[PDB]
Paper text:
Ryanodine receptor type 2 (RyR2), an intracellular Ca2+ release channel located on the sarcoplasmic reticulum (SR) of cardiomyocytes, is essential for cardiac muscle excitation-contraction coupling. Structurally, RyR2 is a 2.3 MDa homotetramer consisting of two functional regions: a massive cytoplasmic region, also known as the cytoplasmic shell, which comprises several regulatory domains (NTDs, NSol, SPRYs, RYs, JSol, and BSol domains) and the stabilizing subunit calstabin-2, and an activation core and pore region, which comprises the Ca2+ binding site and the transmembrane domains. Here, we solved the cryogenic electron microscopy structures of ryanodine receptor 2 variants linked either to heart failure or inherited sudden cardiac death.
Under these conditions, we found that the pore of the RyR2-R420Q and RyR2-R420W channels remained closed, but the cytoplasmic shell exhibited a downward-outward movement compared to the closed WT RyR2, reaching the primed state. However, the mutant channels in the primed state revealed that the NTD-B is rotated relative to the NSol (2-4°). In RyR2-R420W, the W420 residue also results in the loss of both interactions made by R420 in WT RyR2. However, due to its larger size and steric effect, the R420W mutation results in a 0.4 Å downward movement of the 298-304 loop, which might be not significant as it is close to the uncertainty level, measured as the RMSD between aligned NSol domains (0.34 Å), causing a less pronounced but significant rotation of the NTD-B compared to RyR2-R420Q.
Numbering used by the authors:
A (entry chain B): 2053 to 2315
B (entry chain F): 2 to 108
C (entry chain B): 1207 to 1316, 1414 to 1854, 1889 to 1929
D (entry chain B): 436 to 869
E (entry chain B): 3666 to 3702, 3710 to 3858
The structure:
């Protein structure tokens, strides 16, 4: 008789099409076989779905809806090039998220929605846009870094999730160190918050990332500050302003919760 | 700067007063004769409040001078409609708009 | 068909209507020309009214040479006969015009000086009649778009004119308005001094005052007596009518004289303040021709005429609305039915790419641009393009994508970005959810059921252009989703039945053109989730009747579909699987 | 040659340059599609390697220098005056080949298209020139498609130049393709470019084709044919009436069309002249017809407002009286018995006139032709005769479609050829000279 | 058709071997189909050997031997789930020293003159990990501190034991049966 089930119907149809004719479209072949694998792997659907499943009380429904709307605006801004108005949209959305109570009350839902990933790559785009010509939209990097530092401070598991991006954050560590008033709002500050007061993360911190910071500090000690001499500051041979910022991260890496991490 | 020509007569008594909503179907054409807007295309009447600056001045004055059930032609000079900047993408700078407006209902 | 000849032509859409097919044509294996056509074949006939079309490069009688303007010479366009003198040459008056018109002002006002040239609105072009060409056979001046008069014998007295005289209540004519399609003068009468043309070709100078609508002509440096006054907003095309008495006939000269603007400065908007004369490639000579086809409408207005009585006269009645989409060519002030683009390839290509540009400028949530585009492409035009069966395939696919991009793509993407996340509230509705609808372990129809998981909110804005508020620029423009649902279901139901017969006349010309836009729109609507209950049941029965039957006919899954259609059917099946996964998750949370 | 050395002493390798420019294009020719997948991949890899080596050796700037030094001459004649005649002949071909080579060198290569950003500004500076527009457009299209950095440096001036290219050079779908690539690249939308393109192209409504829905309009006329000629037995004054039983102002989104008046024929053919058989055109759109819609006098598709007591569009229960005087060309109207302060005068009379009404869906009108056919609600003006008095003594007056083709079954549709001239309508007794 | 799609994707020009969920799932499916895995009788052992040969033939008759080499070559020496899945499938089709598969694999390499395959093998060997005493000590310090373990087995020390074993088992299977030709080719 008939398939009587969507799974059986799809499993029959895909094989029937493929054995009926040779498909010239790689996209069609890929879609057909993905669909067939989904029909034969129904357990994997639940395996993928459940980690992204969250339950909330009825009282938090409107707050969750507002948070999801803000997250949707932020996600949709990924597909457009950054400009003056996108700056405003990004900032107002991040502010609404921080003001919402669900952001604090449910860190697991925030981690499952991957807000840190979205903000991370949004800042990645801006950082990769125009490095030599000095970073554009510095207020964006500041707001993204403040959001990420708050995300780290909310929960210990969030700090571990942010720790996985320490490599790139240390690569883009010289973004706005020389610029004042951005203190606490730089990727280096995000990296420091990713390891602040966590023995588990301090011990997992490797050698090469420390070597990167050491090399940056050596460069700051050997060479002057280009942006400062451009503004007219006297040309000393070394860069105290960036050196101190690089030293703070090493402080946070070596000293943790009152005792000194020997490793 | 608005002169109104009557296409169909109305009651001639129930003019819009301050603090009312006017329900109209309008069809806007440029002076050359090209349509740029029409509420009849959207099939759903346009409501605006008298004196609350919701619409352009030319349309406001024309609707105020019209009466209930009257179909009239409204010609708005570029000083009472979108000035010299114009509406981006729709109305060019310094354009005279012609409106076919019917005052369906006053509420 | 010859003079006073009447004939009827049968394509055999209905076999019974063929009188002699059976006696001769059925057994021989010949097929009727309309054996597998659901809709009537379009009739094309020879156009009666001549139109202006560009002079072909392969023309047997006309040659056009575009002489470039030097430092001391203005750009010129020369018209000559390649076949003059030889046999088969045609000695008839031939009507020439320039492609772009000069538009007069909307409201009439009540060493050359550079400031005068910048504040002036007078434009000039001149025509050189080469020595040896009879000036009496050459006419120079301006014509409008209405000129469709092809007469072997042309005289200025025979032009079409009318005088509208609006008067006061008493009856005194306060104003009289002469309106005509031709404003031209003859060179033979312009030859006033005499013997001044044999030495050097005569030059009529045409000056148009776009601010006042005054058309005056100068010949050999002296103003002629004839002058024409036109009404505001008149679009005037430069035109020369000439009967050739020489291999070389005349020459369009696009120069300027003192205190007057060149013709290009009025023709083109970018050159509005450029005193240097120019002849851009857009400008070209056109001639009146009869080699054009006309498309008989598939459907006509139904009009009933009858004599009610002796006193009541003859009754003319028409109550059924009919409506067609008109495509307007801006430069030529012309308009053609969009279904005539089936045989006009260049316009079809340009319009398809224009539709693609429309879909691209409002891409990825540009709601302000979408609102602006709602003025150019309207709701009635979108619906008519969606439902029309004679639309060209390219335009069909363009208009479907334009509708989706302007009204639905934003919310479709909003729901697709949040499809893999399941934030289900804990309420009584959530508790009521179960894996299976009843005691029997029967799967319910996918989609149909109660879903409590949080989903993005759908909001739309009314696209009005009289309001001055700017809060409308968030949210995409509103559209009648109910009408869209009903018509989408209707057209899918029709298409499944029609394509199953493998008719030779699919909508758009190909099965891909018939199905890909329709299934894409249906998939967008399904993603948006507008379909509810009975509509979903019917459209699932359309996809597969037997499997989704609720407790022969072939569904979409078994019709020998093209690959692009197969890909979208795979997408629909993927969405149904996602719906099942969501139902399972919501039932797990209910148990928990 | 630029520094004005003798043309004879200068060695200009025209033939060698042309041959090397053709061989180079063949060398950078993209792989064909029908080839096998592995072979196509190998050819693509070789092409990419060649492009990388050329750009690392800086062969792009060499081609740019050749192009720049060739655009100093305005035209082939100018180049043949400065250099030799053969050089002038080959100038255009060499310019096209150089642009084709540049496009082949940068096509499909992200690094090359990113390196060409600095030269993009210099490239669009010569877009208007007719000898380089196509090649420049192709190079611009390749760069915009491949390199996201190009869109970051394309500015409002460049977009406006590309748009004015459409206005000066006519409709070209390649410009539209370039403009589409300006908006979205690799799935990322440039909102500034989108806004600039919209605000600089759309509002004009003068370059792109415009679309609109128009209600179908039909016309119906009586059998009579009224004409004036010297020595002809036809009365010059005529009169008829039309009353509207019902009319719906808005049956669709567009206004209902209803116009009444007189129309003429071209020459002596019974076929109405100057207008399309089908479409949205009615009484007054052409110069062969004269109309009145209750507010305007229509002729030649231009409408002028005419005064009248209690002006209104044609409503239900409106009696319209049309007067035609051929002795002195004059068409006058009277609405509901009151005169309309306006008339058509001094029109062409070398044809046959007939009553006509144009309409769209949603009407109910009745011809009052006088006599047995209809009764006049108002007395005709003195002199004017009812229109039924012009029927030939053998036929019957009836109201039929002005145009030949109507709504009926396709296989029963009567196809009509050209009709014989209706010269017998005007009876001029020809004298037999004696 | 599926194997042909996977082979074309590998042969397509890319700077990096992108992770493909479809490939990483269907390669596992094919490997499990291949292996399908109290003294047994000689007849029982022979039936098992013949069934394994048929199961391997169902794939290498359709071009899996070429695909598992093309994917490794396209990997360009980058360890990843795609490479692990390819190596497991290669082992599955090569179990028992399948001479037909060995001959197909050598003939393809000799005909195509593939250098990327051997370069990728060398890169994977260099990227293979060993014991890390410093990481072991750090994990011991963390465990003695009292914090919960993220992974029970301590995957940081000896990063991937399965990948290295599979990579070298693939090479051993290539040379089994005293396959002198391939032994010299390596």
């Amino acid at each position: 008789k008939k398939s009587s089930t969507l799974q059986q119907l799809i499993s029959e149809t895909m094989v029937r099409w493929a054995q009926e004719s040779v498909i010239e479209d790689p996209e069609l072949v890929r879609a057909m076989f993905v669909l067939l694998h989904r029909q034969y792997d129904g357990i994997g659907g639940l395996v993928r779905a459940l980690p992204k499943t969250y339950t909330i009380n009825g009282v938090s429904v409107e707050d969750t809806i507002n948070l999801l709307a803000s997250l949707g605006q932020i996600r949709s801004l990924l597909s457009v090039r950054m400009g003056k108005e996108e700056e405003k949209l990004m900032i107002r959305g991040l502010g609404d998220i921080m003001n919402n109570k669900v952001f604090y009350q449910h860190p697991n839902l925030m981690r499952a929605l991957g807000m840190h990933e979205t903000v991370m790559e949004v800042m990645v785009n801006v950082l990769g846009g125009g490095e030599s010509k000095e970073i554009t939209f510095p207020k964006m990097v500041a707001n993204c870094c403040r959001f990420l530092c708050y995300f780290c401070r909310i929960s210990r598991q969030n700090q571990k999730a942010m720790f996985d991006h320490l490599s790139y954050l240390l690569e883009n560590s010289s973004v706005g160190l020389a610029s004042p008033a951005m203190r606490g709002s730089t990727p280096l500050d995000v990296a420091a918050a990713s390891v602040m007061d966590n023995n588990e993360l301090a011990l997992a911190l490797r050698e090469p990332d420390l070597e990167k910071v050491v090399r940056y500090l050596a460069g700051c000690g050997l060479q002057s500050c280009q942006m400062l001499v451009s503004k007219g500051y006297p040309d000393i041979g070394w860069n105290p302003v960036e050196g101190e910022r690089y030293l703070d991260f090493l402080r946070f890496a070596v000293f943790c919760n009152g005792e000194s991490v020997e490793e | 700067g608005v002169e109104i020509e009557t296409i169909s007569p109305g009651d001639g008594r129930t003019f819009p007063k301050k603090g009312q909503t006017c329900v109209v179907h309008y069809t806007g054409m440029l002076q050359n004769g090209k349509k740029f807007d029409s509420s009849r295309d959207r099939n759903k009447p346009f409501k605006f409040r008298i004196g609350k600056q919701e619409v352009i001045k030319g349309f406001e004055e024309g609707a105020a001078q019209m009466s209930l059930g009257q179909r009239a032609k409204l010609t708005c000079t570029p000083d009472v409609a979108y000035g010299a900047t114009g509406h981006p993408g729709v109305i060019p700078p310094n354009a005279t708009l012609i409106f076919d407006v019917e005052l369906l209902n006053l509420e | 068909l010859g003079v006073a000849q009447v004939g009827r032509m049968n394509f055999g859409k209905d076999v019974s209507t063929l009188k002699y097919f059976t006696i001769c044509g059925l057994q021989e294996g010949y097929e009727p020309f309309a054996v597998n056509t659901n809709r009537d074949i379009t009739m094309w006939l020879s156009k009666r009214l001549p139109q202006f079309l560009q002079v072909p490069s392969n023309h047997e009688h006309i040659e056009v040479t575009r002489i470039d303007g030097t430092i001391d010479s203005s750009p010129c366009l020369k018209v000559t006969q390649k076949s003059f003198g030889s046999q088969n040459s045609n000695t008839d008056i031939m009507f020439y015009r320039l492609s772009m018109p000069i538009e007069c002002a909307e409201v009439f006002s009540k060493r050359d000086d550079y400031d005068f040239l910048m504040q002036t609105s007078t434009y000039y072009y001149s025509v050189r009649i080469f020595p040896g060409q009879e000036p009496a056979n050459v006419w120079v001046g301006w014509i409008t778009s209405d000129f469709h008069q092809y007469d072997t014998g042309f005289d200025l007295d025979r032009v079409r004119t009318v005088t509208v005289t609006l008067g006061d209540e008493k009856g005194k004519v306060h104003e009289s308005i002469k309106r005509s399609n031709c404003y031209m003068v003859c060179a033979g009468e312009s030859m006033s001094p005499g013997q001044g043309r044999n030495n050097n070709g005569l030059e009529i100078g045409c000056v148009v005052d776009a601010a006042s609508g005054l058309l005056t002509f100068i010949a050999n440096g002296k103003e002629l007596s004839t002058y024409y006054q036109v009404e505001p907003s008149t679009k005037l095309f430069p035109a020369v009518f000439a009967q050739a008495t020489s291999p070389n006939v005349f020459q369009f000269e696009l120069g300027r004289i003192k205190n007057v603007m060149p013709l290009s400065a009025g023709l083109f908007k970018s050159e509005h303040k450029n005193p240097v004369p120019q002849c851009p490639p857009r400008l070209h000579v056109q001639f009146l021709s009869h080699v054009l086809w006309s498309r008989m409408p598939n459907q006509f207005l139904k009009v009933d005429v009858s004599r009610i009585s002796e006193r009541q006269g003859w009754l003319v009645q028409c109550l059924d609305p009919l409506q067609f989409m008109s495509l307007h060519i801006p430069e030529e002030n012309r308009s053609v039915d969009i279904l005539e683009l089936t045989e006009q390839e260049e316009l079809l290509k340009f319009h398809y790419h224009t539709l693609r540009l429309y879909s691209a400028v409002c891409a990825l949530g540009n709601h302000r641009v979408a609102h602006a585009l709602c003025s150019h492409v309207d709701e009635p035009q979108l619906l008519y393009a969606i439902e029309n069966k004679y639309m060209p395939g390219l335009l069909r696919a363009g208009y479907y994508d334009l509708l989706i991009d302007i009204h639905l793509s934003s919310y479709a993407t909003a729901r697709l970005m949040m499809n893999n996340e399941y934030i289900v509230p804990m309420t009584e509705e959530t508790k009521s959810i179960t894996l299976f609808p009843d005691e029997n372990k029967k799967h319910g129809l996918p989609g149909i059921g109660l879903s409590t998981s949080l989903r993005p909110r759908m909001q739309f804005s009314s696209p009005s252009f009289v309001s001055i508020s700017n809060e409308c620029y968030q949210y995409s423009p509103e559209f009648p989703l109910d009408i869209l649902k009903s018509k989408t279901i209707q057209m899918l139901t029709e298409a499944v039945k029609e394509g199953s017969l493998h008719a030779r006349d699919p909508v758009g010309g190909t099965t891909e053109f018939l199905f890909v836009p329709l299934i894409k729109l249906f998939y967008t609507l399904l993603i948006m989730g507008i379909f509810h209950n009975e509509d979903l049941k019917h459209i699932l029965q359309l996809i597969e009747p037997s499997v989704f039957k609720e407790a022969p006919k072939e569904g979409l899954l078994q019709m020998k579909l093209p690959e692009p259609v197969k890909l979208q059917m795979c997408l629909l099946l993927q969405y149904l699987c996602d719906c099942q996964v969501r139902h399972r998750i919501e039932a797990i949370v209910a148990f928990s | 040659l630029s520094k004005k050395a003798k043309a004879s002493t200068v060695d200009l390798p025209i033939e060698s340059v042309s041959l090397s420019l053709q061989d180079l294009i063949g060398y950078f020719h993209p792989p064909d599609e029908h080839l096998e997948h592995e072979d196509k991949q190998n050819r693509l890899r070789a092409l990419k390697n060649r492009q990388n080596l050329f750009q690392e050796e800086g062969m792009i700037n060499l081609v740019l220098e050749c192009i720049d030094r060739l655009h100093v001459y305005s035209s082939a004649a100018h180049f043949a005056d400065v250099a030799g005649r053969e050089a002038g002949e080959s100038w255009k071909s060499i310019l096209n080949s150089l642009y084709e080579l540049l496009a082949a060198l940068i096509r499909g290569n992200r690094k090359n298209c990113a390196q060409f950003s600095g030269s993009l500004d210099w490239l669009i500076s010569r877009l208007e020139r007719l000898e380089a527009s196509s090649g420049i457009l192709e190079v611009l299209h390749c760069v915009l498609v491949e390199s996201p950095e190009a869109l970051n440096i394309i500015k409002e001036g460049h977009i406006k130049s590309i748009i004015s290219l459409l206005d000066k050079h006519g409709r070209n779908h390649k410009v539209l393709d370039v403009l589409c690539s300006l908006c979205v690249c690799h799935g990322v939308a440039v909102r500034s470019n989108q806004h600039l393109i919209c605000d600089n192209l759309l509002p004009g409504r003068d370059l792109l084709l415009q679309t609109r829905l128009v209600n179908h309009v039909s016309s119906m006329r009586p059998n009579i044919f009224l004409g004036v000629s010297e020595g002809s037995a036809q009365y010059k004054k005529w009169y008829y009436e039309l009353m509207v039983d019902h009319t719906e102002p808005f049956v669709t989104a567009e206004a209902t069309h209803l116009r009444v008046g007189w129309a003429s024929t071209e020459g002596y053919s019974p076929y109405p002249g100057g207008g399309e058989e089908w479409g949205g055109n009615g009484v007054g759109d052409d110069l062969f017809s004269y109309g009145f819609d209750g507010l305007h006098l229509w002729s030649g598709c231009i409408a002028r407002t005419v005064s009248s007591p209690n002006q209104h569009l044609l409503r239900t229960d409106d009696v319209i009286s049309c007067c035609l005087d051929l002795s002195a060309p004059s068409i006058s109207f009277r609405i509901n018995g009151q005169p309309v302060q306006g008339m058509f005068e001094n029109f062409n009379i070398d044809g046959l006139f007939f009553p006509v009404v144009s309409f769209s869906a949603g009407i109910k009108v009745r011809f009052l032709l006088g006599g047995r056919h209809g009764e006049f609600k108002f007395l005709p003006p003195p002199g004017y005769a009812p229109c039924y008095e012009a029927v030939l003594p053998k036929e019957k007056l009836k109201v039929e479609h002005s145009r030949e083709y109507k709504q009926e079954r396709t296989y029963t549709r009567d196809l009509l050829g050209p009709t014989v001239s209706l010269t017998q309508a005007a009876f001029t007794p020809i004298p037999v000279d004696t | 058709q599926l194997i042909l799609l996977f082979s074309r994707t590998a042969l397509t020009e890319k700077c990096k071997l992108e992770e493909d969920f479809l490939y990483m799932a269907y390669a596992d499916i094919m490997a499990k189909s291949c292996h399908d895995e109290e003294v047994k009788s000689f007849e029982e052992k022979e039936m098992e050997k013949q069934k394994l040969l048929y199961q391997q033939a169902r794939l290498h008759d359709r071009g899996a031997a070429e695909m598992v080499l093309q994917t490794i070559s396209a990997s360009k020496g980058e360890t990843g789930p795609m490479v692990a899945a390819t190596l497991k499938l290669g082992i599955a089709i090569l179990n028992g020293g399948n001479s037909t598969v060995q001959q197909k694999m050598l003939d393809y390499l000799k005909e195509k003159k593939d250098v990327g395959f051997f370069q990728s093998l060398a890169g994977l060997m260099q990227s293979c990990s060993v014991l890390d005493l410093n990481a072991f000590e750090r994990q011991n310090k963390a465990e003695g501190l009292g914090m919960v373990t993220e992974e029970g087995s301590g995957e940081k020390v000896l990063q991937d034991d399965e990948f290295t074993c599979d990579l070298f088992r693939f090479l051993q299977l290539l040379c089994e049966g005293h396959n002198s030709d391939f032994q010299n080719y390596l």
